[PDB]
């Protein structure tokens, strides 16, 4: 099946930033024709550690910006919702509605997303065991979702640290397509001052592990200049490095593919 | 005074709340050194299964809780799950509770603080004790004056929670601390036998109050059936923690 | 039953240090007559993180020093062994033979201790679940041990951190007397540079929790001047604070005792 | 060359070692790009139960291993549990293995280093990746020249281990890194279905070798029966990791 690559700047810092990243993603989509690219960006960071951190410019602005990306580049779109009422307006532009990790058990949010008819991607909560995502998929199916994804983004491992238990990939594949979040998985929750920390040096090696184990897609946040990002400045991948990373995972996926176990 | 938040996990019926409210009212009259707060959820918005009991809705819930407050004169507390619910709930709830999974949702916290009511935040199973400082700050920014942080366990491997008692003195630096005696022993995805021993630990360490879900017939409860405390055992546990607190309080560290 | 208090300097820095601490422990044993005091000190720190850290002055010197303490003060003695051959010589002075946490599964070490006829205290490994200590007690009984203790000293919680799951106390009590290690439970494994870290501010509160939950004794390392200790300088309790801590736990134990559940 | 350490968990008999040694010898001739090392323990010194299989003793063990080395010309590796065992084991063992629970026992490490043989230390389930730097230093101080660190999982809650692949690049800073594919999926106090996928992960990330326990009839093994790899599946897995390594190696980060 076609491999999915969900990528984009963490937050919608401005419509200009989006178009700049979208342009590169469009270029890569023309090169890597065997990949289905989905542009991602959050119109709101509703769970920042600090009240002083950047959140966004509002739902209205964000949807408008994402719509511009889809219009100008013909790219599929995905963004996350935080309360049930946002599902309807967001579904107007989003091809895939994303459910935040902390909210993966909020029944009404899941139901709100499912009834839009759009695909739904649920970030696996840091508190959830792999086998407990079965009921998450069940809720979505109950709500009408026909295209469901589960995203591995790390599990709570002691304080301010996450570990990726790759056994989750084959387990979750039993009931949904699986995506590996290469950037949030290496972040150190509340690691820094009133902000999240992260170790970019592990992004690439862990993504290689994900494709070797076997997944249906990868999720990566990318920014022209990560150091200047308003969110996840420590983990967002430099846009110039995206091409090489994608090429590498396609190569590893190809050679490992014949060994992927049947679920 | 020492805070004791208790009541049935979910508002299974106005009838159930009244029966429990009566016992809590009696204990309230027997223990003047304690401030009792009646708790019950109008909606279990985060159940694991879509086929599990959620409740009868916000209106039916706020109505039943109002009946408890008016009939017994007890303070009330219930949890909210989305921002719009803060206002209507604040009509009856003296303390607005923020669910553990939602402790980082800025709009929910701000919505609760705006009501002018006290706010009790369940510490997420993914949060470190020191990470709660930011939670309190959000609430203060939102205008909250009476703020509580509730210890309810931390993710420890899969389908298990551990209570790191170091969290009590750490969180006390920025808020009043409550120990959730029933959810802390629950196995996500629990053991009633550990409820009492851990609550004894909490008061020996030092906290500002305890949270306990209680039900007349726990095994018949529509939620947390394996962990809700039988109503008849509530008095004994309260007396026990008051006695332990009386002796141990001499050693509670300053700030 | 008589409450057990195992205390002493972490390592046998010198025979003089031992006698100084022993003198205070003897004084407290005369005051707290309802407590059974056991003097503890390691003749060897065989598991230091760094090859450059203090280990000790040898088994011969240590046993001689411990014997002096028992002779001069009439105090019971306990020390830990690291290899089977040490059980015999150590049993000549030790009333309780201690089994290190990392070695709680080494069958021959356990058997070596059991056949000496002495009491055996096993530190629960940081990797062991409470219910898995049942087989540890089984091995000891198989080897002839008639007086067995299991010591709670924390469990691996993420990297360089330990958490105390107090549910372990009532669980382990099902098959052995339980001791709470108040000082090692708050140490941060490899936290510092080539050494262990620790948070002394949590020693007292956690010990209060242990007695409130219910245990058969407490283990505390104490030193005249912790800051100068050659091992566990961050967690050893100042000797001057021992009296107050013991008084406090006896008071909390008394008031909580009527509520201790029957196993 | 890439290292592949394989063999039956325990020396159940000289007979068993020979049968496994034959297959490993064959693979050794088929894969010249790989250095095979035959492994088997003469004693399971840390079994959970006193009634479980330990072995036939050190002498019988060193004897059987010597037979494998002489008959097939394969390098040998076995683990030691107490200092005195280093010398006699070094007579046949090319690489002396240090058990995970004993990775901090200074005298065992020094005893192994003194033999002049290579030393492979299983990373304790309680150790952080960076904590292994000190382990290597002890060995260097003891005179060790060829040093390996083996990833075999980290304590994750109770009766479960997780493999934090970040450990591979971290440990590589001070030693050659080996990934233990069979013990990493074991549930202390395991799932064979996860052995292959995680070994693929290990080579994609980048390691210097893999460790795998294999047995003709795993379900009949006297130890690690639930995790030992069936002998017949060994060739396929090796070919697979060589292919993945060939492609992925282009991206292994420097130092
Ligand atoms: Zn992000
Ligand atoms: Zn409940
Ligand atoms: Zn010590
Ligand atoms: Zn094995």
Swiss-Prot record, chains B, D:
Gene assigned in the entry: kdsA
Family: Belongs to the KdsA family.
Primary localisation category: cytoplasm
Catalytic activity annotation: D-arabinose 5-phosphate + phosphoenolpyruvate + H2O = 3-deoxy-alpha-D-manno-2-octulosonate-8-phosphate + phosphate
One GO CC term, this protein: cytosol
GO MF annotations in UniProt: 3-deoxy-8-phosphooctulonate synthase activity
Pathway: Carbohydrate biosynthesis; 3-deoxy-D-manno-octulosonate biosynthesis; 3-deoxy-D-manno-octulosonate from D-ribulose 5-phosphate: step 2/3; Bacterial outer membrane biogenesis; lipopolysaccharide biosynthesis
Entry's EC annotation: 2.5.1.55
Protein name: 2-dehydro-3-deoxyphosphooctonate aldolase
Localization per record: Cytoplasm
GO biological process, alphabetically ordered: keto-3-deoxy-D-manno-octulosonic acid biosynthetic process; monosaccharide biosynthetic process
Key words, A-Z: Cytoplasm, Lipopolysaccharide biosynthesis, Transferase
Signal peptide positions (record): none
Oligomeric form and interacting partners: Oligomer.
Pfam families, alphabetized: DAHP_synth_1
């Amino acid at each position: 099946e076609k491999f999915l690559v969900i990528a984009g700047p963490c937050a919608i810092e401005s419509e200009e930033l989006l178009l700049k990243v979208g342009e590169e993603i469009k270029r890569l989509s023309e090169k890597f024709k065997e990949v289905e690219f989905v542009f991602k960006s959050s119109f709101d960071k509703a769970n920042r550690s600090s009240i002083h951190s950047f959140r966004g410019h509002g739902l209205e602005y964000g949807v408008k910006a994402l719509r511009k990306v889809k219009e100008e580049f013909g790219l599929k779109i995905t963004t996350d919702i935080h309360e049930s009422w946002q599902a309807e307006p967001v579904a107007e532009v989003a091809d895939i509605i994303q459910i935040p990790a902390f909210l993966c058990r909020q029944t009404d949010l899941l139901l709100a997303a499912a009834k839009t008819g759009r695909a739904v991607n649920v970030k696996k909560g840091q508190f959830l065991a792999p086998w407990d995502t079965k009921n998450v998929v069940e809720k979505l199916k109950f709500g009408g979702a026909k295209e469901i994804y589960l995203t591995e983004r790390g599990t709570t491992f002691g304080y301010n640290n996450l570990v990726v238990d790759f056994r989750s990939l084959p387990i979750m594949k039993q009931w949904a397509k699986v995506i590996y979040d290469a950037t949030h998985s290496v972040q150190l929750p509340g690691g820094l001052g009133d902000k999240s920390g992260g170790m970019r040096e592990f992004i690439f090696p862990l993504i290689r592990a994900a494709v070797a184990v076997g997944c249906d897609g990868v999720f990566m946040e990318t920014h022209p200049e990560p150091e200047k990002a308003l969110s996840d400045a420590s983990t967002q991948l430099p846009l110039s490095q995206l091409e090489g990373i994608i090429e590498a995972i396609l190569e590893i996926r190809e050679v490992a593919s014949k060994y992927y176990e049947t679920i």
